[PDB]
Amino acid sequence: SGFRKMAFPSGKVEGCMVQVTCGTTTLNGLWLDDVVYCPRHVICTSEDMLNPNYEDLLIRKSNHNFLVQAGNVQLRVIGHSMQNCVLKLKVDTANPKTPKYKFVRIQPGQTFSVLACYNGSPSGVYQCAMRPNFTIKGSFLNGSAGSVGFNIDYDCVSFCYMHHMELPTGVHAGTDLEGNFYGPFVDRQTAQAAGTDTTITVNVLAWLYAAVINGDRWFLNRFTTTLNDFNLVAMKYNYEPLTQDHVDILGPLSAQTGIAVLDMCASLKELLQNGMNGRTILGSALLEDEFTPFDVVRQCSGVTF
C-alpha cells in the first residue's frame, strides 16, 4: 500500500555525468560511448548569450578549448559537432559505465526522473512531468544545465530531457537529446515566457484510480457524465480537455477498479466544485497531475527495473 512520487534509480545515469568547461563557462555533460552531450551554450561567454550565433561560435572553437572531466580524469576531446541546441564532443575513450540506453522525445503529460547535477556531480533525484505548456517545474540553480531527465522502464535507460535554462516564473525549459527544444523556447537570454499552464486531466484521473486502488473512496459519487459535459466543466478550472484517446488510456485502471472512466470523471467534477474540505487524497490536499496511468500501474501492480 501507499503511493509516493517515485523516481527511477539514478545509478545508470550517474555513471554518465561529466563536467564540460569552455573558457569560463561550465555545465554538465552526458557521457555515452565516446560522445559527450551537453547544452551548446557552454561555448558562449558573458556577452554572447543574448543573440549568439552558435554556428559561428563553434567554428571559432578547437578541440582543446573543451575541458571535459569525468571525476578526476580529464577526457581528451578529438572532435566536436552541433545538432540543434545540443553539443556533441567526441572523446578518445568510451564510457565503461555506459548503460543500455535510448533517446526518446516525450509529449506533455509524460513523467520522468531528473538527476540534478552541478560541476558533473549528482546533487539529487526527483520526479517531474512535461507540463502542457512544454515547461517543467524543476529545482535548478546556475550550473545545473546539462542535467538530464530519464525513464528506465525495463532494462533500457530512455533519455528524454536535457536542461538548458530557467524562465521568469521559475519554471524550466530544455531539449530532447537531439537538441530540439520542448516548446517555442530558444537558448537565448532574451525575453521569454511560458504560456498559461493547465492541469493534466488524464493524470489526475489516473491518480484518483490509484487512490481507489489504495482503499480511498470518499470522493466517489453516484453520478456519471458525458465527455462533452465533463470537458465543458474542466476548462472552467484550467484543466486540459479529456480526449477519447485519454478515455481509452484509462481503460485498464477502470477495469481493475470496476469504476467507469466517465464515472470517475463525475467525481472529478465534484472535487473541483467542492474541494477536499479538510480531507487528503494519498497524502495531498491538491489534485495531483504528475502521475500517468502507466505510473499508477507501475507502482501499484508490478515494480522492477
Binding site: 573558457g23 569560463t24 561550465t26 550550473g143 538548458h164 532574451t190 521569454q192
Partner: peptide, 12 residues
C-alpha cells in the same frame, strides 16, 4: 523578463 541560461562560472 529575460530567460536565464543556467550554466555555471568557473575560475580559469
Amino acid at each position: 523578463t529575460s530567460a536565464v541560461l543556467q550554466s555555471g562560472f568557473r575560475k580559469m
